[PDB]
Design an enzyme around this catalytic site. Sequence first.
Site, PDB file in Angstrom:
ATOM      1  CG  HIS B  41      -6.927  -1.792  -2.705  1.00 22.01           C
ATOM      2  ND1 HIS B  41      -5.845  -2.881  -2.489  1.00 22.01           N
ATOM      3  CD2 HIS B  41      -6.256  -0.812  -2.459  1.00 22.01           C
ATOM      4  CE1 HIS B  41      -4.682  -2.180  -2.966  1.00 22.01           C
ATOM      5  NE2 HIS B  41      -4.959  -1.031  -2.875  1.00 22.01           N
ATOM      6  N   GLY B 138       1.762   4.489  -4.101  1.00 20.33           N
ATOM      7  CA  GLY B 138       1.286   4.362  -5.737  1.00 20.33           C
ATOM      8  C   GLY B 138       1.976   3.425  -6.244  1.00 20.33           C
ATOM      9  CB  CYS B 140      -1.305  -0.367  -5.525  1.00 19.66           C
ATOM     10  SG  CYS B 140      -1.235  -0.318  -3.590  1.00 19.66           S
TER      11      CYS B 140
END
Lengths: 301, 301
Positions: B41, B138, B140
């Site tokens: 993503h 953040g 991720c």
Amino acid sequence: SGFRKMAFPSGKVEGCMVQVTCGTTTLNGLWLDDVVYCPRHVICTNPNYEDLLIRKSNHNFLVQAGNVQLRVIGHSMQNCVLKLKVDTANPKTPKYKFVRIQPGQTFSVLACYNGSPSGVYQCAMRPNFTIKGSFLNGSCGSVGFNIDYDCVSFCYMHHMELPTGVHAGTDLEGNFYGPFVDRQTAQAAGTDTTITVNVLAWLYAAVINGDRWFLNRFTTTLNDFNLVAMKYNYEPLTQDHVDILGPLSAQTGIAVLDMCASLKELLQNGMNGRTILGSALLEDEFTPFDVVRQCSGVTFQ
Amino acid sequence: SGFRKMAFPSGKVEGCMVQVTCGTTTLNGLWLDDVVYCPRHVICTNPNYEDLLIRKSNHNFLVQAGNVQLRVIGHSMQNCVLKLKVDTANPKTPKYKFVRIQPGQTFSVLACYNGSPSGVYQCAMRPNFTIKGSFLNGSCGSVGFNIDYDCVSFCYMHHMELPTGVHAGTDLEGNFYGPFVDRQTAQAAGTDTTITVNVLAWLYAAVINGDRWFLNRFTTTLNDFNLVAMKYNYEPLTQDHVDILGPLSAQTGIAVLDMCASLKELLQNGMNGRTILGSALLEDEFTPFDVVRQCSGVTFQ
């Protein structure tokens, strides 16, 4: 969101861990620049360590940095630690400092065996200067530390287990935390207390994570809290503690003395089968800094 | 002695963490040999990621390994992860594998922001395929992992937070754990259960550490236990679980079904204000392997 007992990344410290052997004793040492630090009860043969160190030679100390042998060219004693000068500077030496901590402060421990790191966990220096660690034979010499941006602050070297199962050791200049010694006596831990300011920081962390069932309408003065705190074997809360909690009070809009009133109620009534942040106990091993770090987002390297 | 939520030393993994930027999105990536893995993503602009990836160029992906820029020479999609071929192999690449875990198994998480590691903690894959982690915006792309001797087994990449505050992600081939997707829906976690076999391992750890107040004279059959377990939302206990607990039964001389009887009593009566291993709850995030590792002494590197 979420809240976990979090430790610092341990890579910078793994690169300093070495194995030290003398006689039939083997333990862990810490290698920074061209010195290897380790506990002094590694020396041979109730004790007088100055006697024992003069009867020794550089070649009695075997030092393994992974596979590579390290050549000991000098030794000396600093309080309860031994400094072994080797002929090679550690290329993986991070920027570091030696720093002594206060009861109530937290650090990360890198448990080690034969110079090989085994695991990393977070813990606190109890008010009676012990730590509730996890150690087995051979973990002597493992260190505790904090990391601030790129700098490693070493605060602890492990030395021994006490009869109750808790642990005792020194800062990195060789001075013990608490009234303990590196020889066999019937030494025991003093009676411990709960770290009040940390419990309040933990409650702010719960509020920030959606637990609010313990909040109340009441309030209280500093004096009336401490009267109740001392009943349940809790440290006194100081005005400085109230200032250090300020930023957390702001972020949530819960006044510090309002949250004290909730803690007073929790102490007088228990939790009634509810939990806070996955816990059925009031947790006291998170400081205000720890809570802000884990809910604001600060990194290191 | 002592028992702590322990994580693996994180150094081998810190050396693989990088920053990936595309458009106005920034997250963490994992750099092994000459590939950088990260969640998909991250691609620009309800979704159809094959559409979106064809409208993109190598030069759209900025990759920072510390200071040094990394030059992306190729891309491709594998399930919900993105593979970015770069022109430089990571000299710090450890021996590794990609491995998928089972609910009830534990791993260590290295939480990261902008490619910089922030902290390390231990956790478990819940039976409903979520994990109760600690993550902020953040994080991720942070990974979970186990270490066996010198080899890093990567098992998790973090992707998203669910409405309840728990976390969801994929293995390193891009396949999600559980029934979740990398797009905005009203997805929620299923109802969870307690990991029975882990609670029993934790009880053995307490016995090994001197807590025995919960032990009893009784015993019970597998069938009569499971009847009581299901009442309190506990996983069923299988004969294989009883075999895996064997070595711990031997070390302590408490038969597996005897300890089940103690767990049955604990579930029916609560703890009466006592604690086990510093906890007022039955802990279910330690496996039998974890307990043996922390009480026998096994290291890694």
